[PDB]
Write a protein that binds this ligand. Structure first.
Ligand SMILES: Cc1ncc(COP(=O)(O)O)c(CNCC(=O)O)c1O
Ligand SMILES: Cc1ncc(COP(=O)(O)O)c(CNCC(=O)O)c1O
Lengths: 399, 399
C-alpha cells in the first residue's frame, strides 16, 4: 500500500460511513427552468417548495430578457478581476442602485455572498480587534472570520443577554474595534435577528453592526429592503453583505454594502475582489432590471408574505410545529435524519419537491425539511402541497 | 469621539496611506464587450492586452448564442445550492465533459476557482496531514489551506530540490497523507510548474499532486488540455482545481476534478458546494459549447501560441527582459509602483490597455505590467502594440 492509495481508502471509508449514518446527499436532476413548478429528468412535474427564489425572479421573463440584452450589448464573459479590465459601466450602475436600495453610501460586487463574507473581516479588522457572531452564523461568515486575525466571540442564538456578555468580555479583553455580526434572517431556522435591540446594544459599547441579508433582501420589510428595514434600523447598519443569488435573480453574484471608505478599502485590499473574476455582464445587467422591478411595486413582496401567511396557517392547522405567521423559511423539524430523508422522498411521490436537511448542514439530532415559500405559488399548488404534507405527515407519524 | 467613528477614521487614514504609497487602484469603466479591442466610456478604443480571455471565447458568437439558448431552455438563475434544487441536467453534462477533457474520473462545479480552492483542503485533509505549496501559489490556494487543519510546508518557487527538502521534513514530522499543491501556470510571472519532475518526486514519497489550472485550461498542451498535458502527465494528476472565467468563457464558475471518491466527498462536505449558489444555467450551457469548440479544433490555442511567440520575441528585440516565447503571460517588471501606473497610463494614451500590478497583488518593490496574450489579436494590433511598448518603454527608461 502506498500513502496516496491509502488516502483514497480513507476517503472511500468516509464516504461509506456517511451513507451508513443516513447522511448521504443525493442530487435531483431538474430538466426545466427554476419555477414554482418544475420537472426532473424523469418527466415528473412537482411543486418546488425549497428554492431561494422567493420573489420568482429566477425565471422572470423581464429578468430573462434583461440577460439577453446585456449579452447583446456587453458580451458573455469579462475574464478579468475588477481592477484590470473587469469593470463595465454595468457594475458601477448596479453598485449605485444597490446602495440606494439598501440605504448605504457605496457597494462592492463579489462573485458570491460566500466571497463577500470571505473577504470582509480580514480586510477591515486586525489582531487588536474583535468580531462577535451569533452562534448560528452562516458558514461563509465563520470562514471569513477564520481568515481574519481578529479575536472571536460567539453569543447564543438570538440571545441579547449573551450578546451583552460577550461584548463585556471583548472589551475586558482589550478589544480596539468591535464588530457584531449576524445573519439578518437565519438560513436554517427562519428566525429574524433582533437588529433593533442589537443596534441599541452596539451603540452602548461603541461596536459596529454588520448583517448578512441573503434571506432578506428583496422581501423583508414593507418595501423589501431587508431585515434592517423590518427592524426599524434602515440607514443604521454599518455593514451589509448579501447575495444576488437568492431573491434578486438567483443566477450568481454577491455584494458588500457599507460607507464609502469601507467599500473603498475592500476594493484595494479584499482578496476575492483582487484575485477572483468579476460578475458576468448578463448577471449585472439582469440585476439592474431586478431593482427596477422591486422599486416599482411591492406586489411580489406582498404576495410572498400572503402565500407565507396562508401556508403557515395551513401547517399549523394540520398539527405540524410551525409558528404560523410570516417567515418564508418554514423549518419542519424532524430531528432524525432518516425521517427527513423519508419525508422528502414520500412528498416527492405525492408531487412536492423538498429536500432533507441533515448534518453537516444542520446539527445532528436536529434534521429538518426547510420549506421555502415563493411569491410564484398559486392557491392550487399551495392547497395541493398542504394535502401532500397532511398525508405524508400522517403516514410517517409526524402528526 | 466614538469607537465606531474612530474605526472609520482608521479606514480613512489607511486609504490615504495606500494612495501616498502609490498603491491605490482606480477602475477603468469599459463600455463594450470583452475583446481584443475595447472601448472605455470616454470613447477611446484601445488594444486589450491584460484579460484572461486567452482563447477569445469571452465574446465568441457561438458562446454568446449558447448562453442565449440556455436562458431560453433552462432559465436565468437556479437560486439554490446543488443538493437542494440547484442541479440541472446541464451541470451533470458539463461535469462529465470536463472530466473527459481533463483526464479525470469526475468533476465538481463551484461558483469560482477561488471557492474550489477554498473548499478543497479542509474537506480532504486533517491535522494529521500535510500540504506542500510552491511559495508563489495563488491567494485562493493559501486561503483554502489556511481553512484546513493540515500542516503547511512551502518550497521555493519552482525549486525541485527544495520540494524534496519539504517532503523529507513532512515525512520526518510524521505526516499521514501529503498533498503537493501548485499553480499549473503561475498568475504573476507566467512560469510553468515542473509537473513532470513533481509527479516523479511525489511518487517517491507517495505524496499526492494537485494543481491549480486557471491559467492553463483550454490552451496549455498540444490539445489545450492543461499544464499536465504540456508536461506529459495527463491522467496522472490527483487533483485539478480550475476556473471557467479565464480561457473557458470568462463569465463565472470553477471546478475541482479528481477520482470519483474525492469528488463525491467534495459534494458531501465541501463548504462552498453545500452553502453557496450553483453555477447559473447560461454559464453551464455556454461552457458545454466552449468544450464543443475546443474539442473540435486546436486553431484558437494555436493562434494564441503564435501571437505570444511573436509578441515575446518582439519585446525581446526591443530590449525588454522578456525571453523565449510561448508563455501567454508576459511580465514586464517596473518594481516602482508609480512607474507601474505611469507605464500603464502612457500605454493607454498610445492605444494599449494594460494595468499596473503592485502590492498586495505582487510584493512591495516588485511592481509590474502583466501583459496577457489572446488568440483574438491580428498582427496589425500586435504590431501597433509593439510600437506602443517600444515608445513608452524608452520614454520611461525601461529600454
Ligand atoms: C491561479 C489562480 N487560481 C484561482 C483563481 C480564482 O479564479 P476565479 O476567477 O475562478 O475565482 C485565479 C484568478 N486570477 C485572476 C488573475 O490572475 O487575474 C488564479 O489566477
Ligand atoms: C446567510 C447566507 N449567507 C451567505 C450565503 C452564500 O451566498 P452565495 O450563494 O451568494 O455564495 C448563503 C447561501 N445560502 C444557501 C441556502 O440557504 O440554501 C446564506 O444562506
Amino acid at each position: 500500500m502506498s500513502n496516496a492509495e491509502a488516502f483514497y481508502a480513507s476517503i472511500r471509508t468516509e464516504l461509506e460511513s456517511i451513507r451508513a449514518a443516513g447522511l448521504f446527499k443525493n442530487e435531483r436532476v431538474i430538466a426545466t427552468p427554476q419555477g414554482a413548478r418544475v420537472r426532473t429528468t424523469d418527466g415528473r412535474e412537482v411543486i418546488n417548495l425549497c428554492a431561494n427564489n422567493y420573489l420568482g425572479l429566477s425565471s422572470h421573463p423581464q429578468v430573462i430578457e434583461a440577460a439577453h440584452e446585456a449579452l447583446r450589448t456587453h458580451g458573455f464573459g469579462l475574464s478579468s478581476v475588477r481592477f484590470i479590465c473587469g469593470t463595465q459601466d454595468l457594475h458601477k450602475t448596479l453598485e449605485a442602485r444597490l446602495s440606494a436600495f439598501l440605504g448605504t453610501e457605496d457597494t462592492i460586487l463579489y462573485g458570491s455572498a460566500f466571497d463577500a463574507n470571505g473577504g470582509l473581516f480580514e480586510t477591515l479588522l486586525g489582531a487588536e480587534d474583535a468580531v462577535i457572531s451569533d452562534a448560528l452564523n452562516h458558514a461563509s461568515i465563520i470562514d471569513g472570520v477564520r481568515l481574519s486575525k481578529a479575536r472571536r466571540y460567539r453569543y447564543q442564538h438570538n440571545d441579547m443577554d449573551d450578546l451583552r456578555v460577550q461584548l463585556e468580555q471583548a472589551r475586558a479583553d482589550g478589544a480596539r474595534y468591535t464588530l457584531v455580526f449576524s445573519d439578518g434572517v437565519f438560513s436554517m431556522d427562519g428566525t429574524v435577528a433582533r437588529l433593533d435591540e442589537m443596534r441599541a446594544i452596539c451603540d452602548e459599547y461603541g461596536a459596529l453592526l454588520g448583517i448578512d441579508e441573503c434571506h432578506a433582501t428583496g422581501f423583508m420589510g414593507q418595501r423589501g429592503r431587508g431585515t434592517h428595514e423590518a427592524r426599524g434600523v434602515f440607514g443604521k447598519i454599518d455593514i451589509i453583505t448579501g447575495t444576488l443569488g437568492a431573491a434578486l435573480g438567483g443566477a450568481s453574484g454577491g455584494f458588500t454594502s457599507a460607507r464609502k471608505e469601507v467599500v473603498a478599502l475592500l476594493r484595494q485590499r479584499s482578496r476575492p475582489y483582487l484575485f477572483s473574476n468579476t460578475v458576468a455582464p448578463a448577471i449585472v445587467g439582469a440585476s439592474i432590471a431586478v431593482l427596477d422591478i422591486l422599486e416599482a411595486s411591492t406586489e411580489l413582496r406582498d404576495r410572498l408574505e400572503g402565500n407565507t401567511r396562508f401556508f403557515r396557517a395551513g401547517l399549523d392547522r394540520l398539527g405540524f410545529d410551525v409558528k404560523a405567521g410570516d417567515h418564508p423559511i418554514i423549518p419542519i423539524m424532524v430531528y432524525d435524519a432518516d425521517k427527513a430523508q423519508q419525508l422528502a422522498q414520500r412528498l416527492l411521490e405525492l408531487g412536492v419537491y423538498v429536500v432533507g436537511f441533515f448534518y453537516p448542514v444542520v446539527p445532528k439530532g436536529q434534521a429538518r425539511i426547510r420549506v421555502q415559500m415563493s411569491a410564484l405559488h398559486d392557491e392550487a399548488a399551495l392547497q395541493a402541497a398542504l394535502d401532500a404534507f397532511g398525508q405524508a405527515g400522517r403516514e410517517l407519524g409526524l402528526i
